[PDB]
Design a protein around this nucleic acid. Structure first.
Lengths: 98, 103, 78, 18, 90, 98, 78, 96, 92
DNA sequence: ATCGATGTATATATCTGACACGTGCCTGGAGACTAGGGAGTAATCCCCTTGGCGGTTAAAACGCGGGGGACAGCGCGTACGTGCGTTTAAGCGGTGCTAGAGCTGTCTACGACCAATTGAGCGGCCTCGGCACCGGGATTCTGAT
DNA sequence: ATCAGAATCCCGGTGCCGAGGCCGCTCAATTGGTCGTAGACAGCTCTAGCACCGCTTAAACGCACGTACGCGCTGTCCCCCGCGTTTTAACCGCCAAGGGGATTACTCCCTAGTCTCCAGGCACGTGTCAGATATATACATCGAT
C-alpha cells in the first residue's frame, strides 16, 4: 500500500529521458497511415526515420498536455477534459493546433 | 610563395572561414559575397557555440558527469532566457521536460 | 485489432504524467488518439512528398526532419 | 569577461522590464 | 561534410576536462547549420531589399541584429567588430 | 430607457471597418517608443507607416481579445480578466501572443 | 504619453473583439502589451531602416519588420 | 508573343525575369514560369470569384477590402493558406 | 518606373465577372498577396532543389512545392491547372 | 504529535561499448595575377515631412444609481486512483534475403548568352458615374401594458 | 397573453472624386542563333530494410473498492454599465520652411575567375575508461497510533 504515489511517478518520468510509447505499434500505425497517401504501393522506412517521428510525436504531445494543464487549472478544477485540450488546440492556431 | 596560413588562424577564431565562404558562395544567397562576411559569420558562430557549450558544462558539472549528453543540452538551453527565445520553435531529441510542479 | 488502439492507456498516462498532469479523465484516451492521428497525418504526408520528388520508395530520416522544418517545429541531431 | 548577465524574472519571456 | 572538429576544439578551450557524446555532437552540428542558414537567408533578403548584389559586412551585422535577441546580439556584434578589425589588420 | 444596449454596439462595431484609435495620440506614442532605441536623434515618419502600424496593432489587439474572451467563458464567467489574457499570451506561443 | 490608448478606445477594441463585460483592471495591462508589441515591431523596422543610409522610417520597413516577425500585412506593400 | 501561348492571362516573361533575378537557383526550367503563372492565375481566380459573390450579396459593383476579408475568412482552405495575414481595413468576422 | 500585376488581375476579374469593378486598395491587396504567394513557392522550390542536389528549377520542383505548400483540395486543382497549361505550351 | 519501516541517497566492484587519439591520404583551401564592374562619393532638386495657428465638436472625462455578476460554502454522487491476478504482445537475438540506395560512365537535349526589334505595359489626363450622405417614410421589435 | 415609440429598412436626391478608358512613350519581352554542360539513362555493386522463428518477461488488461472531486445550488457583496453634464484636444483647414530621398554621373578598389600547390580534414583503426549496473549502508520520512 503506497499512498499519493503519483508524485513519485511524475518526478521519475520528468527526470528520465527515454521514449514512452513502444516502437512496434508505433511503426505499425505509421505504416498503416502512410499506406493511404502512397497511392497503394508499399514504402520502406529507415531506422532513424521512425525514431525521429516518434520523438517529434512525443514532444508535440507532451507540449500539448502541459499547455492544456494550465487551462484546466484556470477553470478551477484538476482533472483533464477533452474540451480543454480542444480549446488549447484552437487557441494555439490553425497550423500550431492541427 | 609564402606559407599557407588559413584565414581562421589570422582572425583568431577556431571556426573555418574558408568553409563558410564556400558555403555562402554555393548557398545561392547572392551572386557576390564580401571578404569580411564569412569572418563575421565565423565569429558569431564561434561565440554561440562557446555560450552553449559553457552552459552545457555548467549543467553537467553538478551531476558529476564529464560527458555532454543530449539531456544536458536541453537543460542548459531551457535555463537561459535568450537562448530559449532563439530555440523556442525547435525541439531537442532525447531531451526531457524541465521539472516543474504547479501549486 | 486496429493499429490506432495500440497506444494503450498507460502510455498516454505516462505522457500526461511527463507533462505534469495530476488527474486524467477517462475520455482523454479516446480523444488524443485522434489528435496523435492528425499530427501523424500531416507530417508523413509531407515526408512522402519529399520522397515523391526524388525517384525513391523509402522515407529516410532526412525527409522527416525536412517536413518537420517546413511545418515549423523542427528537430536537431539528424 | 563581462559575460551577459542572467537573472530569473517572474515572467517566462524577457520582454518587459527584463 | 559535417564538422565535428571545431566544436571539440572550442569545447576543450572553454573546458579542459569535459567531453561530449556523439549524439550531442550531431545536435550541435545541426544547430550551427540551422543558425548559419537563418542568418544567411536574413542577409540575403536584406541585400535584395536594397537593390544590392554583394553581401558586405554590414548586411550580416544587421541580419544577426534582427535574428538574435537583444542582450546577446550586442556581445555578438562586439565579437564581429573584434574579428574583422584583426582580419584586415594583417 | 435603453437596456442591454451593448449588443447593438457589438453589431455596429463588427460591421464597421474604420480605425478605432485616434491618430495623433498613437503617433505620439509611436514617437515616444522610437526615441528610446535611436540613442537620441530624432527620426521622421512617413504618412503611411503610422497608418500601417496602427492597423497591425488593432489586428493584434482584436486577436488577443477575441481569443481571451473564449477563455473567460471557458472558466464559466463573462468578465474578461487580466490573468486570463496573460494566460492566453503564455499559451498562444512565443510568436503568436508575444 | 502612454495614456493615448484611452479607456473607451480599449473598450471599443474589446467590443470589436466580441467581448461583453470588461473588468476595471484590464486598462493597466493592455497598455503594457501594446507597448511591448510596438517596442518589438518598431525596433525591427528601425534597424531595417538603419541598415540603409536613411533616417526616415517608411511603410515598407514596417511591413518588412512585420513579415520577419510573422504577421504579414497586405495593402501597403507597394 | 508567347505570353498567351498557353492560354493564360498572367505574363510568362515577367515571372521568368523575376525567377532569374530572385537568385533562387542558378538555372531555371522552361515550363516552370508557365506552371507558376498558371497556378497564380488559378489562385487569384478563386479568390476573386469568392469576392465577387461577397460583393454581389451586398449590391455593390465595386469590390472593397472588406469583401476580400469576408471571402478569405469564409472559405476554410483560403483561411488555412493565409493564417498569419492581416488585411488592411478588413473587419473581423460577424461572430458572437 | 514601377512594376505591378494590376492589369492581369483586372483581366482575370473581367473574365470571371463581366460587370464587376475593383477599387484601388483591393488592387494593392491583391498585388501584395500574389507577390507573397509567388515568393513563398519560389523559395520553397529553391530549398527543395538545393535539398536534392539540383541546380535547375524544372516544373516538377515547383509542382512538388505547390503540392506541399497549398492545402489538400486546392492542390488537386492546382496540379490539374498547371500541367494543362504546360501541355498547351508544348503544343507549338 | 513521536516512531518506524519504506523509501532515498551514497559507496564500492565490474565490465563494456562508445570515445579519444593516431595514421594515412587527398580534395578543398590558400597564394598570385587579371579584368571588370558594382559600389562609394559629390550635386541637385524638389517632394514630402514637420511645425504652427485658428476654429469647431464629437469624443473623453467625471459622477452616481443599481442590479447583475463573481465568489464562498456545501452536499452529492460519480468516476478515477490503487492493488492484485492474469495474460499477452513487445522485445532480444539470430539468420536469411533481396529491393533498392548509391556510385559511375555517357551522351545529349536543354538552357545561358548576345544582338536586333518592337509592341505590351506604364505614366499622365480626363470624365462621369457608383457610392457616401441626408431627408422622408414604413416597418418591427422591446421594453412597456 | 398584448402593444406603441424609437430602431431599422428602403427610396429618392445630390454630390464628388476615384475608377476606367484613352493616348503617347519606351525598354523589357521576343526571335534567332550558338555553345557548354546538368542530368537522363543505363548498369553494376553492396547494403540495410524486411521477414521469420524461438524464447523471455515485463507491461497491459481487468476487476473490485474507496474516496476525492466536478457540479449544482444558494446566498451575499460589489462594481461595471448606463445616463446625464461638463470639458477638451483631435481634427480640419490652411500656410510656410526646409531635410533629405531620389536621381545622375564619375571613378576605382573589391571581387569573380583561373591556375598551381599542399595540409587540414575525413575514413579507418584500436586501446581505454565513464558510466550503466549490481550490491550494500546510512538517513529522512509520512502514515498508523
Amino acid at each position: 500500500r503506497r499512498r499519493q504515489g503519483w508524485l513519485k511517478e511524475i518526478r521519475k518520468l520528468q527526470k528520465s529521458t527515454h521514449l514512452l510509447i513502444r516502437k512496434l505499434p508505433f511503426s505499425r500505425l505509421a505504416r498503416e497511415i502512410c499506406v493511404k497517401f502512397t497511392r497503394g504501393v508499399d514504402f520502406n522506412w529507415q531506422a532513424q526515420a521512425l525514431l525521429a517521428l516518434q520523438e517529434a510525436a512525443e514532444a508535440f504531445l507532451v507540449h500539448l498536455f502541459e499547455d492544456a494543464y494550465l487551462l484546466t487549472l484556470h477553470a478551477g478544477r484538476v482533472t483533464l477534459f477533452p474540451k480543454d485540450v480542444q480549446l488549447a488546440r484552437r487557441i494555439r492556431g490553425l497550423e500550431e493546433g492541427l | 610563395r609564402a606559407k599557407a596560413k588559413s584565414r581562421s588562424s589570422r582572425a583568431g577564431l577556431q571556426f573555418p572561414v574558408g568553409r563558410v565562404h564556400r558555403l555562402l558562395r554555393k548557398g545561392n544567397y547572392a551572386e557576390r559575397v564580401g571578404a569580411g562576411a564569412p569572418v563575421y559569420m565565423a565569429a558569431v558562430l564561434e561565440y554561440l557555440t562557446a555560450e552553449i557549450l559553457e552552459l552545457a558544462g555548467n549543467a553537467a558539472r553538478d551531476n558529476k558527469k564529464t560527458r555532454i549528453i543530449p539531456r544536458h543540452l536541453q537543460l542548459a538551453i531551457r535555463n537561459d532566457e535568450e537562448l530559449n527565445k532563439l530555440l523556442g520553435k525547435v525541439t531537442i531529441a532525447q531531451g526531457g521536460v524541465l521539472p516543474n510542479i504547479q501549486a | 485489432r486496429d493499429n490506432i488502439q495500440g497506444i494503450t492507456k498507460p502510455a498516454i498516462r505516462r505522457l500526461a504524467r511527463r507533462g505534469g498532469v495530476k488527474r486524467i479523465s477517462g475520455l482523454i484516451y479516446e480523444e488524443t488518439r485522434g489528435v496523435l492521428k492528425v499530427f501523424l497525418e500531416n507530417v508523413i504526408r509531407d515526408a512522402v512528398t519529399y520522397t515523391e520528388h526524388a525517384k525513391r520508395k523509402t522515407v529516410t530520416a532526412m525527409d522527416v526532419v525536412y517536413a518537420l522544418k517546413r511545418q515549423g517545429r523542427t528537430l536537431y541531431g539528424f | 569577461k563581462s559575460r551577459r548577465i542572467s537573472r530569473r524574472p517572474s515572467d517566462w519571456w524577457v520582454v518587459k522590464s527584463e | 561534410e559535417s564538422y565535428s572538429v571545431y566544436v571539440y576544439k572550442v569545447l576543450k578551450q572553454v573546458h579542459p576536462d569535459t567531453g561530449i557524446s556523439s549524439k550531442a555532437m550531431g545536435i550541435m552540428n545541426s544547430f550551427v547549420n540551422d543558425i548559419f542558414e537563418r542568418i544567411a537567408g536574413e542577409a540575403s533578403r536584406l541585400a535584395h531589399y536594397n537593390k544590392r548584389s554583394t553581401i558586405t559586412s554590414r548586411e550580416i551585422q544587421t541580419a544577426v541584429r534582427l535574428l538574435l535577441p537583444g542582450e546577446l546580439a550586442k556581445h555578438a556584434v562586439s565579437e564581429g567588430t573584434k574579428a574583422v578589425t584583426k582580419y584586415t589588420s594583417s
